[PDB]
Write a protein that holds these residues in place. Structure first.
Motif, PDB file in Angstrom:
ATOM      1  N   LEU A  51       0.816  -1.219   0.000  1.00  0.00           N
ATOM      2  CA  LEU A  51       0.000   0.000   0.000  1.00  0.00           C
ATOM      3  C   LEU A  51       0.856   1.278   0.000  1.00  0.00           C
ATOM      4  CD1 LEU A  51      -2.741   1.418   0.214  1.00  0.00           C
ATOM      5  CD2 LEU A  51      -2.726   0.951   2.674  1.00  0.00           C
ATOM      6  N   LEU A  52       1.932   1.259   0.776  1.00  0.00           N
ATOM      7  CA  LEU A  52       2.826   2.404   0.864  1.00  0.00           C
ATOM      8  C   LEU A  52       3.780   2.477  -0.330  1.00  0.00           C
ATOM      9  CD1 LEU A  52       3.569   2.415   4.697  1.00  0.00           C
ATOM     10  CD2 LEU A  52       1.702   3.496   3.458  1.00  0.00           C
ATOM     11  N   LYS A  53       4.231   1.327  -0.803  1.00  0.00           N
ATOM     12  CA  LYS A  53       5.074   1.274  -1.986  1.00  0.00           C
ATOM     13  C   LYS A  53       4.334   1.549  -3.302  1.00  0.00           C
ATOM     14  CE  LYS A  53       7.830  -2.376  -1.611  1.00  0.00           C
ATOM     15  NZ  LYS A  53       7.884  -3.729  -0.991  1.00  0.00           N
ATOM     16  N   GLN A  54       3.005   1.395  -3.327  1.00  0.00           N
ATOM     17  CA  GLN A  54       2.218   1.691  -4.540  1.00  0.00           C
ATOM     18  C   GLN A  54       2.449   3.105  -5.082  1.00  0.00           C
ATOM     19  OE1 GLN A  54      -1.183   0.404  -7.133  1.00  0.00           O
ATOM     20  NE2 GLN A  54       1.044   0.669  -7.172  1.00  0.00           N
ATOM     21  N   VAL A  55       2.618   4.054  -4.169  1.00  0.00           N
ATOM     22  CA  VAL A  55       2.809   5.449  -4.512  1.00  0.00           C
ATOM     23  C   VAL A  55       4.053   6.037  -3.825  1.00  0.00           C
ATOM     24  CG1 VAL A  55       1.465   7.529  -4.957  1.00  0.00           C
ATOM     25  CG2 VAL A  55       0.279   5.455  -4.470  1.00  0.00           C
ATOM     26  N   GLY A  56       4.966   5.182  -3.347  1.00  0.00           N
ATOM     27  CA  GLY A  56       6.200   5.615  -2.680  1.00  0.00           C
ATOM     28  C   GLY A  56       5.979   6.516  -1.475  1.00  0.00           C
ATOM     29  N   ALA A  57       5.068   6.099  -0.596  1.00  0.00           N
ATOM     30  CA  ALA A  57       4.656   6.856   0.588  1.00  0.00           C
ATOM     31  C   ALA A  57       5.240   6.239   1.858  1.00  0.00           C
ATOM     32  CB  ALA A  57       3.144   6.888   0.662  1.00  0.00           C
ATOM     33  N   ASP A  58       5.296   7.035   2.936  1.00  0.00           N
ATOM     34  CA  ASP A  58       5.772   6.575   4.257  1.00  0.00           C
ATOM     35  C   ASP A  58       4.619   6.220   5.207  1.00  0.00           C
ATOM     36  OD1 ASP A  58       8.288   7.143   3.127  1.00  0.00           O
ATOM     37  OD2 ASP A  58       8.891   8.546   4.696  1.00  0.00           O
ATOM     38  N   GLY A  59       3.400   6.646   4.873  1.00  0.00           N
ATOM     39  CA  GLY A  59       2.200   6.185   5.558  1.00  0.00           C
ATOM     40  C   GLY A  59       0.946   6.458   4.757  1.00  0.00           C
ATOM     41  N   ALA A  60      -0.179   5.996   5.290  1.00  0.00           N
ATOM     42  CA  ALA A  60      -1.477   6.183   4.665  1.00  0.00           C
ATOM     43  C   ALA A  60      -2.630   6.009   5.652  1.00  0.00           C
ATOM     44  CB  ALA A  60      -1.655   5.203   3.522  1.00  0.00           C
ATOM     45  N   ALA A  61      -3.751   6.614   5.280  1.00  0.00           N
ATOM     46  CA  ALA A  61      -4.977   6.538   6.024  1.00  0.00           C
ATOM     47  C   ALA A  61      -6.064   6.041   5.091  1.00  0.00           C
ATOM     48  CB  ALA A  61      -5.336   7.909   6.573  1.00  0.00           C
ATOM     49  N   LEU A  62      -6.619   4.878   5.407  1.00  0.00           N
ATOM     50  CA  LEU A  62      -7.856   4.429   4.791  1.00  0.00           C
ATOM     51  C   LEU A  62      -8.993   4.791   5.735  1.00  0.00           C
ATOM     52  CD1 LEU A  62      -9.051   2.985   2.332  1.00  0.00           C
ATOM     53  CD2 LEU A  62      -8.793   0.823   3.620  1.00  0.00           C
ATOM     54  N   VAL A  63      -9.991   5.501   5.225  1.00  0.00           N
ATOM     55  CA  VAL A  63     -11.119   5.943   6.032  1.00  0.00           C
ATOM     56  C   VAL A  63     -12.405   5.470   5.356  1.00  0.00           C
ATOM     57  CG1 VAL A  63     -12.345   7.997   6.897  1.00  0.00           C
ATOM     58  CG2 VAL A  63      -9.863   7.854   7.025  1.00  0.00           C
ATOM     59  N   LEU A  64     -13.073   4.492   5.974  1.00  0.00           N
ATOM     60  CA  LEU A  64     -14.386   4.027   5.523  1.00  0.00           C
ATOM     61  C   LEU A  64     -15.431   4.599   6.476  1.00  0.00           C
ATOM     62  N   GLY A  65     -15.887   5.824   6.197  1.00  0.00           N
ATOM     63  CA  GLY A  65     -16.797   6.561   7.084  1.00  0.00           C
ATOM     64  C   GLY A  65     -16.136   7.015   8.384  1.00  0.00           C
ATOM     65  N   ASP A  66     -16.501   6.371   9.492  1.00  0.00           N
ATOM     66  CA  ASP A  66     -15.912   6.632  10.820  1.00  0.00           C
ATOM     67  C   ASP A  66     -14.840   5.614  11.224  1.00  0.00           C
ATOM     68  OD1 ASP A  66     -17.682   8.790  11.032  1.00  0.00           O
ATOM     69  OD2 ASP A  66     -19.119   7.684  12.273  1.00  0.00           O
ATOM     70  N   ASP A  67     -14.703   4.524  10.463  1.00  0.00           N
ATOM     71  CA  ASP A  67     -13.634   3.544  10.679  1.00  0.00           C
ATOM     72  C   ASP A  67     -12.329   4.070  10.053  1.00  0.00           C
ATOM     73  OD1 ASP A  67     -15.359   1.542  11.998  1.00  0.00           O
ATOM     74  OD2 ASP A  67     -16.129   1.076   9.996  1.00  0.00           O
ATOM     75  N   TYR A  68     -11.415   4.510  10.919  1.00  0.00           N
ATOM     76  CA  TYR A  68     -10.091   5.003  10.531  1.00  0.00           C
ATOM     77  C   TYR A  68      -9.074   3.881  10.675  1.00  0.00           C
ATOM     78  CZ  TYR A  68     -11.485   9.916  10.250  1.00  0.00           C
ATOM     79  OH  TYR A  68     -12.090  11.089   9.868  1.00  0.00           O
ATOM     80  N   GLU A  69      -8.271   3.683   9.631  1.00  0.00           N
ATOM     81  CA  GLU A  69      -7.137   2.761   9.657  1.00  0.00           C
ATOM     82  C   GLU A  69      -5.893   3.514   9.192  1.00  0.00           C
ATOM     83  OE1 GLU A  69      -6.921  -0.913  10.222  1.00  0.00           O
ATOM     84  OE2 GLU A  69      -8.695  -0.440  11.407  1.00  0.00           O
ATOM     85  N   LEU A  70      -4.856   3.479  10.014  1.00  0.00           N
ATOM     86  CA  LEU A  70      -3.640   4.198   9.744  1.00  0.00           C
ATOM     87  C   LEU A  70      -2.566   3.170   9.562  1.00  0.00           C
ATOM     88  CD1 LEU A  70      -4.018   6.982  12.466  1.00  0.00           C
ATOM     89  CD2 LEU A  70      -4.985   6.896  10.146  1.00  0.00           C
ATOM     90  N   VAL A  71      -1.785   3.357   8.503  1.00  0.00           N
ATOM     91  CA  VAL A  71      -0.731   2.445   8.103  1.00  0.00           C
ATOM     92  C   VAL A  71       0.532   3.268   8.021  1.00  0.00           C
ATOM     93  CG1 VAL A  71       0.144   1.012   6.212  1.00  0.00           C
ATOM     94  CG2 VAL A  71      -2.306   1.018   6.769  1.00  0.00           C
ATOM     95  N   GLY A  72       1.646   2.696   8.461  1.00  0.00           N
ATOM     96  CA  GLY A  72       2.925   3.402   8.458  1.00  0.00           C
ATOM     97  C   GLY A  72       2.874   4.662   9.302  1.00  0.00           C
ATOM     98  N   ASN A  73       3.612   5.675   8.865  1.00  0.00           N
ATOM     99  CA  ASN A  73       3.730   6.940   9.578  1.00  0.00           C
ATOM    100  C   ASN A  73       2.714   7.935   9.063  1.00  0.00           C
ATOM    101  OD1 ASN A  73       6.046   5.739  10.773  1.00  0.00           O
ATOM    102  ND2 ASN A  73       7.313   6.527   9.072  1.00  0.00           N
ATOM    103  N   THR A  74       1.716   8.208   9.904  1.00  0.00           N
ATOM    104  CA  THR A  74       0.620   9.122   9.590  1.00  0.00           C
ATOM    105  C   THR A  74       0.548  10.248  10.610  1.00  0.00           C
ATOM    106  OG1 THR A  74      -1.008   8.038  11.026  1.00  0.00           O
ATOM    107  CG2 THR A  74      -0.693   7.127   8.795  1.00  0.00           C
ATOM    108  N   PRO A  75      -0.241  11.296  10.315  1.00  0.00           N
ATOM    109  CA  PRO A  75      -0.579  12.194  11.406  1.00  0.00           C
ATOM    110  C   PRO A  75      -1.603  11.517  12.318  1.00  0.00           C
ATOM    111  CG  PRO A  75      -0.997  13.194   9.221  1.00  0.00           C
ATOM    112  CD  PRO A  75      -0.888  11.708   9.060  1.00  0.00           C
ATOM    113  N   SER A  76      -2.032  12.227  13.352  1.00  0.00           N
ATOM    114  CA  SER A  76      -2.936  11.671  14.344  1.00  0.00           C
ATOM    115  C   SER A  76      -4.318  11.467  13.749  1.00  0.00           C
ATOM    116  CB  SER A  76      -3.044  12.605  15.544  1.00  0.00           C
ATOM    117  OG  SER A  76      -3.858  13.722  15.228  1.00  0.00           O
ATOM    118  N   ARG A  77      -5.066  10.528  14.318  1.00  0.00           N
ATOM    119  CA  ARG A  77      -6.446  10.300  13.905  1.00  0.00           C
ATOM    120  C   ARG A  77      -7.227  11.618  13.800  1.00  0.00           C
ATOM    121  NH1 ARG A  77     -11.134   6.043  14.626  1.00  0.00           N
ATOM    122  NH2 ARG A  77     -12.789   7.554  14.075  1.00  0.00           N
TER     123      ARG A  77
END
Ligand SMILES: */C=C/C1=C(C)C(=O)N/C1=C\C1=NC(=C\c2[nH]c(/C=C3\NC(=O)C(C=C)=C3C)c(C)c2CCC(=O)O)/C(CCC(=O)O)=C1C
Ligand SMILES: */C=C/C1=C(C)C(=O)N/C1=C\C1=NC(=C\c2[nH]c(/C=C3\NC(=O)C(C=C)=C3C)c(C)c2CCC(=O)O)/C(CCC(=O)O)=C1C
Ligand SMILES: [Ca+2]
Ligand SMILES: [Ca+2]
Lengths: 480, 480
Positions: free
Chosen positions: B334-360
């Motif tokens: 997921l992070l290598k797809q776009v050469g990122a250091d983190g990501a946030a998948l947000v399905l409505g109110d369900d937050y999922e943070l991967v790698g290095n993200t800012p705070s929820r």
């Protein structure tokens, strides 16, 4: 001031279509016209990549973009739009116009062939120009179609006309050069087509004005929707033309003339019909160029007949001058060499006058006048009294001349008489409302007796003059 | 005001050669530079036809004119002049410059091959740029040769340099876009070469200013002798360069950069050597374009590896989200797809943070901020705090982002951290002496800590983002 307005970068279009600029690399939107949403039915913000969902043609546009075909056209049946595009550096400029319903391609095809058959039979140019005007009149539906031939000074005069009586007839009128200033003429040499369906359209901006890909404002030179010059629109209002449409006639890389169409009320023309009129101009261009090459070649070889026949006469003659003028036939040829009605050969103080010349004293005084001028090879003028008021006294016999120096102090001069021409101008040629130079309000016929002017010297005639000078230069040097 | 000066129509040349404009039909003189007599040794008035007596090359120039070779060059040994010409509509523009004596063609040839061998072995671009700079330095003899790479905003920075110590070193400096304004950059895209041998030349007029053939002033776009902009000459004086010479590096139809040469005192370069430097730029252009195509393709197919591997993981997963993030390898991808250091998948109110993200909470507030913006497909920025000052609080973890909407109210956002770059500018980038905008007087190094900015998103990376969005868009619609 007149020719400095940059007509190719107005940052705006006319109302009858919309415009999208995208980046070739990715087909991302870079600029759009404010009305684009009204045609496309999707916004496409700046940065948005084009997809098949919003632009169904995107697949064929990519294909077009890689290929060699300089322009793109596509029928968008869904929205009844004609789409077209072209390349501009690294950008694609898409233009969308409403499709012209209720028109036949067999109509165009059949009509175009009736001109092409006509044009390929080697007919008189006048009739080629008229029936070309009359086809464009037929298929375009304007109130007036005319063919406007530029002169060497970039004034032009109307040489063919077809119309519906609803607008005035300008057949045979001259119009001054400033009516189509130089930047317009140069633009029209490369972009051969233009349409202004409604003189009172409100310009529709292109935002952002500065393209973020190039750093510059959009070069709209090949944009068929480009907003035209405000000053020209006053010309159209002053003329009383609510719509116009013109097509360049380009012969040997040069703007030869225009097919100019005007309607009294607003009027539009389909992309197809406009493509058809460009075709017609293209055929006529080929006709004109061959008509010129053949008239020239046949005149050059006819002057060649005379040239060599005098060349052998001078060589074979004892005193040489008698080759130019020994009897009837030599004098006859001297005048026919350059299509003149008389001539003066002057070997120092020995004056010889052939045909219809001014007086010995008048010619003396002309030579003195010439001597003060700095002339490389030959001096030609069709209007001698313009630069030498004195010569107004003998305009009937020498309105035009070619003079050739020979020694250091001999001369050979040919003479042509005045031809009286009444020239009709579409309004006063000199009049412009100063303020910014604005267009005159009256295109009422303005007459002008043209005095002290001869038939102009053709380039074969001047070529023969220079040629004959060389042979004479090489003999007086040999004799001494 | 800056980009509106028409640099292509100054009606004048520089002193180091002279200029003759003639009419293609007949080769008659139409315009000349005031210094033409000083080079040609014959006047040639306006109207004068060119002959073999005054222009020995006239025979080969006629031959050239009919042919396809876009330019004419001829060695005039008699007068030690290099003659050159080109076509401009229906005109030939002849330029005469003193020949460069004491130079070897085997020198050029041998030197050019040493670059061509180097360039064809697929070497690192940095070393290609340096040895290209160093050959142009070698054969041109200037005090500094540099290679200037334009950025997406048309500022540029120096990426190679060769020199003699006599001028300053600018290696690694950025310069603002206004230093080479857009009309200059567009001119340099099509006319790839320019030389200014002496900053304090007195401009030499072209008379008549209005060409009698065209009705317009001469388009000097392809004139190698053209007088340059007065304002740029203040730039040269302000910089302390008495001579300059530059060559466009054009890759895929776009101005990629410049080889820029400057001398402390005056300096000239032969037509031959200038033709040689254009050659060098041309080879380097080919290198650059292949280096780009190969880096891109290899990155696109590498992102393809990841893309499909996630695509199959999402399809094969029960809850689908677990294809993006089920274990180590899915998150990694997921992070290598776009050469990122983190990501946030947000399905409505369900937050999922991967790698290095800012705070929820920070991500919540970013999404709300995004929702107000109007985004077609994806929003990418390398500088989030530019448009969202609030995000300055988490620049270390999310200086750059790509955000992708999915439902109506889900999101997928990737994060890139701040990279701290100290950028050196050749003088203050914002400074210009207002009055007419004049150039700054100081090119002393001007430092600038660059904050809140990530590594920029490559076009393969944004392409993968948009691609991955489609698959996700098509699954949530399917699941519901
Ligand atoms: C110096 C400003 C101008 C003055 C004064 C003026 O009279 N015209 C000026 C500028 C422009 N004219 C442009 C276009 C244009 N002009 C004509 C002229 C004619 N229309 C006619 O019917 C006849 C006579 C039969 C003439 C001589 C034409 C045909 C055109 C082309 C457009 C069209 O089809 O009407 C012009 C350019 C406008 C643009 O392309 O933006 C300018 C700037
Ligand atoms: C808005 C007016 C201008 C300002 C202000 C300004 O700074 N430049 C302005 C205009 C022009 N610059 C033109 C040419 C030009 N500028 C450069 C810039 C550089 N020379 C350098 O050494 C470096 C840095 C390493 C830079 C960024 C160059 C290379 C050139 C090309 C000419 C040359 O080889 O020196 C220019 C055009 C002049 C013309 O062609 O007439 C203008 C109008
Ligand atoms: Ca004509
Ligand atoms: Ca770059």
């Amino acid at each position: 001031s007149c020719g400095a307005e940059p007509i190719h970068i107005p940052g705006a279009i006319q109302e009858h279509g919309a415009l999208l600029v995208l980046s070739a690399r990715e087909f991302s939107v870079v600029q759009a016209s404010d009305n684009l949403a009204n045609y496309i039915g999707v916004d496409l913000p700046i940065g948005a990549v084009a997809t098949e969902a919003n632009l169904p043609f995107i697949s064929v546009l990519s294909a077009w973009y890689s290929g060699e075909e300089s322009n793109f056209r596509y029928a968008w049946a869904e929205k009844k739009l004609d789409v077209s595009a072209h390349r501009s550096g690294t950008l694609v400029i898409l233009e969308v116009e409403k499709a012209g319903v209720g028109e036949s391609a067999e109509k165009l095809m059949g009509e175009l062939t009736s001109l092409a058959k006509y044009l390929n039979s080697a007919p008189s140019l006048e009739d080629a120009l008229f029936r070309t005007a009359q086809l464009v009149s037929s298929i375009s539906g304007h109130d007036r179609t005319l063919i406007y031939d530029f002169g060497l000074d970039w004034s032009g005069h109307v040489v063919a006309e077809a119309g519906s009586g609803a607008l005035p007839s300008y057949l045979g009128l001259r119009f001054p050069a400033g009516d189509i200033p130089p930047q317009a003429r140069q633009l029209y040499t490369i972009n051969r087509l233009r349409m202004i369906p409604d003189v009172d359209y409100k310009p529709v901006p292109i935002r952002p004005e500065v393209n973020a890909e190039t750093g510059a404002v959009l070069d709209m030179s090949f944009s068929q929707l480009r907003s035209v010059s405000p000053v020209h629109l006053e010309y159209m209002r002053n003329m009383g033309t609510a719509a116009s449409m013109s097509v360049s006639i380009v012969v040997n890389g040069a703007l030869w003339g225009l097919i100019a169409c005007h309607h009294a009320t607003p009027h539009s023309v389909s992309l197809a019909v406009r493509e058809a009129c460009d075709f017609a101009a293209q055929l006529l261009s080929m006709r004109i160029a061959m008509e010129q090459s053949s008239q020239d070649a046949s005149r050059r070889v006819e002057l060649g007949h005379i040239q060599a026949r005098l060349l052998k006469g001078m060589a074979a003659a004892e005193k040489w001058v008698d080759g130019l003028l020994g009897g009837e036939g030599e004098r006859e040829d001297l005048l026919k060499q350059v299509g003149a009605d008389g001539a003066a050969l002057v070997l120092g103080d020995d004056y010889e006058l052939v045909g219809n010349t001014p007086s010995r004293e008048q010619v003396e005084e002309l030579i003195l006048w010439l001597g003060e001028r700095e002339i490389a090879d030959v001096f030609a003028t069709d209007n001698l009294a313009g630069n030498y008021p004195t010569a107004a006294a003998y305009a009937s016999v020498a309105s035009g001349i070619i003079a050739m120096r020979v020694s250091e102090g001999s001369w050979l001069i040919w003479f042509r008489p005045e031809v009286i021409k009444t020239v009709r101008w579409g309004g006063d040629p000199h009049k412009t409302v100063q303020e910014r130079i604005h267009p005159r309000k009256s295109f009422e016929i303005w007459k002008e007796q043209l005095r002290n002017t001869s038939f102009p010297w053709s380039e074969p005639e001047l070529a023969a003059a220079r040629e004959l000078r060389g042979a004479i230069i090489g003999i007086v040097l040999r004799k001494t």
